[PDB]
C-alpha cells in the first residue's frame, strides 16, 4: 500500500542518484521494473513525462537530472535499462540474500 510505494519511492530516488544500490533480492527485483518504467518516461521526455516521473520522485535536481542526464544514455534500447544483480552475502541476524541492481551500462 502506502508503503509499497514509499519504497519504490526513496529507492527509485536514491538509485538514479547512484544507479545501482544494495537491497535484498525482491526489493531490487521490483525497484527495477518501476524505477525501470520511470526511466522509459525520462525517455518520453516532456512536460507530461516529467510531470509524472517527478509526480512520484518529487525533486527537480534529479527528476530533470535523469530525464536529461541519463535518459539519453538510453534513448535507443527497449526497457531493461536496469540489470538486477543478486549478491553473495546476507545481512546478519537476519540472513537475507540482499543483492545489488544498477542501470545496465
Amino acid at each position: 500500500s502506502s508503503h509499497r510505494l514509499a519504497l519504490y519511492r526513496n529507492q527509485a530516488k536514491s538509485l538514479l542518484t547512484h544507479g545501482r544500490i544494495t537491497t535484498t533480492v525482491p526489493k531490487a527485483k521490483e525497484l527495477r521494473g518501476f524505477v525501470d518504467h520511470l526511466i522509459h518516461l525520462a525517455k518520453r521526455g516532456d512536460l507530461h513525462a516529467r510531470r509524472l516521473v517527478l509526480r512520484d520522485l518529487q525533486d527537480v535536481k534529479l527528476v530533470r537530472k535523469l530525464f536529461d542526464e541519463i535518459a539519453p544514455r538510453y534513448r535507443d534500447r527497449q526497457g531493461g535499462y536496469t540489470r538486477v544483480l543478486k549478491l553473495a552475502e546476507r545481512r546478519r541476524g537476519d540472513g537475507a540474500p540482499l543483492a545489488l541492481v544498477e542501470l545496465v551500462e
Binding site: R20, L85, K86, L87, A88, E89, L100, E102
Partner: peptide, 18 residues
C-alpha cells in the same frame, strides 16, 4: 570457492568489475 553465482572478496568480476 564462491557462492555459486556471485563475485566476492575474491572476485569483482563475473564479466564486469563490479
Amino acid at each position: 570457492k564462491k557462492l555459486s553465482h556471485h563475485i566476492c572478496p575474491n572476485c569483482g568480476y563475473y564479466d564486469g568489475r563490479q
